[PDB]
Amino acid sequence: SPRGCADGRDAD
Amino acid sequence: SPRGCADGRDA
Amino acid sequence: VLTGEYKKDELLEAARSGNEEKLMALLTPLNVNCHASDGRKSTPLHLAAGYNRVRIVQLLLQHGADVHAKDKGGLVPLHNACSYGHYEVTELLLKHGACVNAMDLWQFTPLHEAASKNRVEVCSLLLSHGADPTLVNCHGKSAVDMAPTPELRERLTYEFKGHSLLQAAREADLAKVKKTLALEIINFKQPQSHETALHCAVASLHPKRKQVAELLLRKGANVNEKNKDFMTPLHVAAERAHNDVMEVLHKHGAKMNALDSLGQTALHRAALAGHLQTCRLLLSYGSDPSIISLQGFTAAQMGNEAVQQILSE
Amino acid sequence: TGEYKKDELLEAARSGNEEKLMALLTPLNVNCHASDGRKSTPLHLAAGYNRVRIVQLLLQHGADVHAKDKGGLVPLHNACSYGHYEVTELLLKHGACVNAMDLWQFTPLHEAASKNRVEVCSLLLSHGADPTLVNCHGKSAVDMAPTPELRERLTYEFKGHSLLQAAREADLAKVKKTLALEIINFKQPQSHETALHCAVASLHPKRKQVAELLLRKGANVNEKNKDFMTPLHVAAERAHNDVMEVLHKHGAKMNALDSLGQTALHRAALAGHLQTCRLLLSYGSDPSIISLQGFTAAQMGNEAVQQILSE
């Protein structure tokens, strides 16, 4: 259980 | 060379 | 049901890329809350939030998107928005009833996301809708603990107390208002002497003491606070002939006849010091010159012949 | 011989054996150090092991409160580290340096705070401990506090002590700053409303007591939100008469102007709140004021409102 990363991206 | 502990005891 | 499987993939893709036309050609009540098959199993809303597709977020929500839906890790779309600093997406989600402290399977909240990535403005927005920065994740860590600068740690705490006060005010919850105000410093006391800042200001030799005294009183200072020896600020100002602040104290409701622990008024202590104008002022303010202290004295009985003269009228 | 004696004196200090201590204590060894371990003096040991009477006796008979152990600790460190309130106070009363630093620039407050001795911290702060002083890792005492409760208390007390000092010097700017930081004045970041605006707009029956309490605690009675409305403008347009009375009793400016040049009376008039308009007039609202759009309150009101503004 290594926590992942939300789907999405930083602006710019 | 780490930091040690004061001589003493908890109440 | 392989068509609604492919159709789904295309809806998701439109959401992710911000393709408004394609979204609304594919969006039906049957796929609005679909989940992706691989990756994180995101809904359209998750993707639109993560990729900052503000207009897509509006349309999804408007056409029945579930603001509480979970991806494979237990993230709600608010997590996605907060993690990548999408302020306006965040505001929209909250506006449509997102749980500000929704937790994923690791007990991470939206504020954990924003704070850990230094999204200062997103953190403030979250706190203003009741985010709580003391909630811990599975590693025992709060949003405060993950904030990478002291400025942000301080801001989370300050704004959390602030909004708890505002909400307690909105709900007219007196006990909760008292509690969040328990640590105001205006009447903080020197532990030994029991003096407050007002006692210190009226004792000051420095030029601005009148202004400081006014300011503390405007901001909640108790004008009649008593120190260890039952001296009010009036007693302190009077014995030092600090006449300018005496007036300020009078104006703010100082009790002219307050008794110290020796049964003396400010007038006793001014008389004893030989402060002539101070005595005149205290008299004009309604000090009672007959009061007999615990050692058996009137103010006149403790003073020089000029004080005596002033008092015999 | 003085060395086997030393060991025994030191042992008497550690163990609280007053009899042995006083039989062995001389001006020649009062400030001896152990040959090994921390190289503690008797006072370090008596302080660490909470031997209050022995501390007292040591100080009476020439013990050096600035003596150092091998790591640069003074006895105050030992006392603070192990939470011995009474010892700490004694040591301070005999002139121990409250911000004494060991080889790692740990102060007594670092020690008290790190080991969660809240009461010792309080004491130390009273004697002028500075919880922003950093050790050699750049960590203040506040940083070492293992709970937010303690952090909050360390901060509170230090702000308190600092406000007192600033008052003593009539440092208006410094006092003015620490007070603007107070939570009672908190502004909703977007709308700029304070607790007083929220209170007077509340639909809950205790609103009157909340408003009165907030004002007792220093709320600015004329604070303006984003639209330059005061709490009076908010209460009046909602006909919350009970809190208007509180507001008036605490010197609300009856004729304060919002961003449209309107008074609270303009707003009550516009909403048709007849009794509210009557109250505001009774409090000295000026019905003649003309908004930035060119209207009096009477020009915005129904005929009932206009009558009220005549009588």
Beta strand spans in A1-12 (E): none
Per 3-state DSSP, chain C is made up of helix, strand and coil in percentages (nearest 5) of: 50, 0, 50
Taking the CA of residue D283 and the nearest CA in chain C, the distance in Å comes to: 21
Q: Using alpha carbons, select from C85, D247, D299, D103 the residue that is nearest to residue D276.
A: D247
Taking the CA of residue A4 and the nearest CA in chain C, the distance in Å comes to: 8
To test the contact with chain C by mutation, choose from D142, D162, D176, D184 the residue with the greatest count of C C-beta atoms within 10 A, namely: D184
Would the CB atoms of D78 and B9 count as touching at under 8 Å?
no
Query: How many Å apart are CA D120 and CA D209, to the nearest integer?
Result: 37
Would the CB atoms of C212 and D168 count as touching at under 8 Å?
no
Instruction: Give Cα separations from C303 to C107, C230, C259, C269, C300 (angstroms).
Output: 73, 22, 18, 9, 5
Query: How many Å apart are CA D158 and CA C235, to the nearest integer?
Result: 27
Query: How many Å apart are CA A7 and CA A4, to the nearest integer?
Result: 9
Do residues D310 and D274 lie in contact, with contact meaning Cβ atoms separated by under 8 Å? no
3-state SS, residue C210: helix
Query: How many Å apart are CA C115 and CA C125, to the nearest integer?
Result: 12
Residue span(s) of chain D under CATH 1.25.40.20 come to 1-179, 180-310
CA atoms within 13 A on the CB side of D167: 31
Sign of the torsion angle spanned by Cα atoms D165, D168, D169, D171: positive
Query: How many Å apart are CA C91 and CA D190, to the nearest integer?
Result: 12
Contacts of residue C140, defined as CB under 8 A and 6 or more positions apart, other chains included, come to none
For D:210-249, CB contacts with C below 8 A are: 210, 213-214, 216-218
SS (H, E, C) D150-174: HHHHHHHHHHHHHHHHHHHCCCHHH
Return the CATH number of the domain spanning residue range C1-181.
1.25.40.20
Q: Which residues in chain C precede a discontinuity of more than 2.5 Å between C and N?
A: none
User: Widest CA span of chain B, in angstroms?
Assistant: 29
Q: Residue C302 corresponds to which tokens in the numbers above?
A: 């403790």
Q: Using alpha carbons, select from C119, C144, C55 the residue that is nearest to residue A6.
A: C119
Do residues C272 and C247 lie in contact, with contact meaning Cβ atoms separated by under 8 Å? no
CA atoms within 13 A on the CB side of C311: 26
CA atoms within 13 A on the CB side of D173: 0
**D1-179, which class in CATH?**
mainly alpha
Length of chain C: 313
Residue pointed to by tokens 């600090």 = C242
Residue D281 corresponds to which amino acid?
L
Q: Residue C37 corresponds to which tokens in the numbers above?
A: 């098959």
Q: Using alpha carbons, select from D237, D197, D243 the residue that is nearest to residue C169.
A: D197
Would the CB atoms of C73 and A3 count as touching at under 8 Å?
yes
Task: Kindly provide the b/e burial profile for residues D240-259, where b requires at least 16 CB atoms within 10 angstroms of the residue's own CB.
Answer: bbbbbbbbbebebebebbbe
Query: How many Å apart are CA C143 and CA C112, to the nearest integer?
Result: 5
Instruction: Give Cα separations from D284 to C98, C101, D65, D201, D252 (angstroms).
Output: 46, 47, 67, 22, 11
Would the CB atoms of C71 and A7 count as touching at under 8 Å?
yes
* Other chains touching B, judged by 3 or more CB pairs under 8 Å: D
Q: Is C146 on the interface with D (CB under 8 A)?
A: no
Instruction: Give Cα separations from C308 to C62, C271, C299 (angstroms).
Output: 85, 8, 8
* Other chains touching D, judged by 3 or more CB pairs under 8 Å: B, C
Return the DSSP state at C303.
S
3-state SS, residue C129: coil
Would the CB atoms of B8 and D82 count as touching at under 8 Å?
yes
By what method was this entry solved? X-ray
Q: Using alpha carbons, select from C76, C73, C39, C112 the residue that is nearest to residue A2.
A: C73
Our CA angle for D132, D133, D136, nearest 5°, is: 130
Q: Using alpha carbons, select from D167, D176, D164, D169 the residue that is nearest to residue C205.
A: D169
Q: What is the dihedral of CA D58, D63, D64, D65, to 10 degrees?
A: 10
Q: Is C53 on the interface with A (CB under 8 A)?
A: no
Query: How many Å apart are CA C174 and CA C168, to the nearest integer?
Result: 7
3-state SS, residue C18: coil
Q: Residue D188 corresponds to which tokens in the numbers above?
A: 């909703």
Q: Using alpha carbons, select from C145, C131, C68, C59 the residue that is nearest to residue C100.
A: C131
H/E element, C150: helix C150-170
Q: Is D126 on the interface with C (CB under 8 A)?
A: yes
Q: Is C122 on the interface with A (CB under 8 A)?
A: no
Q: Is D109 on the interface with B (CB under 8 A)?
A: no
Return the DSSP state at C148.
S
CA-based R_g, chain A, Å: 10
SS (H, E, C) chain D: CHHHHHHHHHHHHHHCCHHHHHHHCCCCCCCCCCCCCCCCCHHHHHHHCCCHHHHHHHHHCCCCCCCCCCCCCCHHHHHHHCCCHHHHHHHHHCCCCCCCCCCCCCCHHHHHHHCCCHHHHHHHHHCCCCCCCCCCCCCCHHHHCCCHHHHHHHHHHHHHHHHHHHHHCCCHHHHHHHHHCCHHHCCCCCCCCCHHHHHHHCCCCCHHHHHHHHHHCCCCCCCCCCCCCCHHHHHHHCCCHHHHHHHHHCCCCCCCCCCCCCCHHHHHHHHCCHHHHHHHHHCCCCCCCCCCCCCCCHHHCCHHHHHHHHC
To test the contact with chain B by mutation, choose from D54, D82, D119 the residue with the greatest count of B C-beta atoms within 10 A, namely: D82
CATH architecture assignment, domain D180-310: Alpha Horseshoe (1.25)
Task: Kindly provide the b/e burial profile for residues C120-145, where b requires at least 16 CB atoms within 10 angstroms of the residue's own CB.
Answer: bebbbbbbbbebbbebebeeeebbbb
Residue span(s) of chain C under CATH 1.25.40.20 come to 1-181, 182-312
Q: Residue D269 corresponds to which tokens in the numbers above?
A: 């008039």
Angle between helices D52-60 and D85-93 (to 10 degrees): 10
Nearest to C84 among A1, A4, A9 (CB): A9
Q: Residue D131 corresponds to which tokens in the numbers above?
A: 């919880």
Contacts of residue D137, defined as CB under 8 A and 6 or more positions apart, other chains included, come to D104
Query: How many Å apart are CA D196 and CA C97, to the nearest integer?
Result: 26
* CB-CB neighbors (< 8 A) of A2 in chain C: none
Q: Using alpha carbons, select from D219, D146, D149, D223 the residue that is nearest to residue D183.
A: D219
Angle between helices D274-282 and D264-271 (to 10 degrees): 160
Query: How many Å apart are CA C143 and CA C110, to the nearest integer?
Result: 9
Q: Using alpha carbons, select from D29, D27, D30 the residue that is nearest to residue D3.
A: D29
H/E element, C101: none
Query: How many Å apart are CA C141 and CA C150, to the nearest integer?
Result: 16
H/E element, C3: helix C3-17
Return the CATH number of the domain spanning residue range C182-312.
1.25.40.20
Query: How many Å apart are CA D284 and CA D255, to the nearest integer?
Result: 8
CB neighbourhood size of D303 (10 A): 7
Taking the CA of residue D82 and the nearest CA in chain B, the distance in Å comes to: 5
Contacts of residue C246, defined as CB under 8 A and 6 or more positions apart, other chains included, come to C202, C234, C237, C238, C266, C278, C281, C282, C285
Query: How many Å apart are CA D269 and CA D297, to the nearest integer?
Result: 6
Would the CB atoms of C162 and D186 count as touching at under 8 Å?
yes
Length of chain D: 311
Do residues C229 and C194 lie in contact, with contact meaning Cβ atoms separated by under 8 Å? no
